[PDB]
Amino acid sequence: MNIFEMLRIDEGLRLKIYKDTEGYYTIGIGHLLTKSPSLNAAKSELDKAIGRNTNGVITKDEAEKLFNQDVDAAVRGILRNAKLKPVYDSLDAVRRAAAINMVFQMGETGVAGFTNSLRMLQQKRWDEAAVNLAKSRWYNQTPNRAKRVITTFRTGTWDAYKNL
Ligand SMILES: Fc1c(Cl)c(F)c(Cl)c(F)c1Cl
């Protein structure tokens, strides 16, 4: 198990434009195209991302290319964010993957409200942190995924993913 395998499980793989859990146009391995309700706008974003005129369908190789870029972008974003870098640096590699997972799903803006959770994680108060993380829109809207990510933060193991 690693961050790539983990997000592959959580996001799936679809080669045609689909709507994510929030109703937003997406492709590949959870590559958000746009929050716009216009399919044409989404198709434009896809073409720009891939570098060719696609009309809504990509190959597995192309999906994996975008996926690698997205994982890279999430990490680089954490490292440039003053509110996130210290907590990330304080973690082991397994829990770091859980951090990347969250940023991949909700972005840096989606995680701005997790200040108290972040403190508890840096304090290594794993059970308290797990309890706090679940008190969120995130947990309520995607409970099964959140539970897996939270278990990863609580235990520092891959137990929530090893069966999957
Ligand atoms: F280190 C982190 C980071 Cl960078 C992050 F964005 C979240 Cl949501 C998190 F929980 C942890 Cl531990």
Curated annotation (Swiss-Prot):
Changing D20 to E/Q: Loss of 99% of enzymatic activity. Changing N132I: 5-fold decrease in enzymatic activity. Its EC number is 3.2.1.17. Induction: Expressed late in the viral replication. Keywords: Antimicrobial, Bacteriolytic enzyme, Cytolysis, Glycosidase, Host cell lysis by virus, Host cytoplasm, Hydrolase, Viral release from host cell. Changing G30F: Almost complete loss of enzymatic activity. The enzyme is destabilized by 1.5 kcal/mol. GO terms for cellular component: host cell cytoplasm. Pfam families: Phage_lysozyme. Changing S117I: 500-fold decrease in enzymatic activity. Changing T26E: Complete loss of activity at neutral pH; covalently bound substrate. Its main location: host cell. Optimum pH is 7.3. Changing S117F: 10-fold decrease in enzymatic activity. It catalyses: Hydrolysis of (1->4)-beta-linkages between N-acetylmuramic acid and N-acetyl-D-glucosamine residues in a peptidoglycan and between N-acetyl-D-glucosamine residues in chitodextrins. GO terms for molecular function: lysozyme activity. It is an enzyme of class 3 (hydrolase). It comes from the Viruses. The keyword Transport does not apply. Belongs to the glycosyl hydrolase 24 family. HAMAP family: ENDOLYSIN_T4 (MF_04110). This is Endolysin. It comes from Enterobacteria phage T4 (Bacteriophage T4). The gene is E.
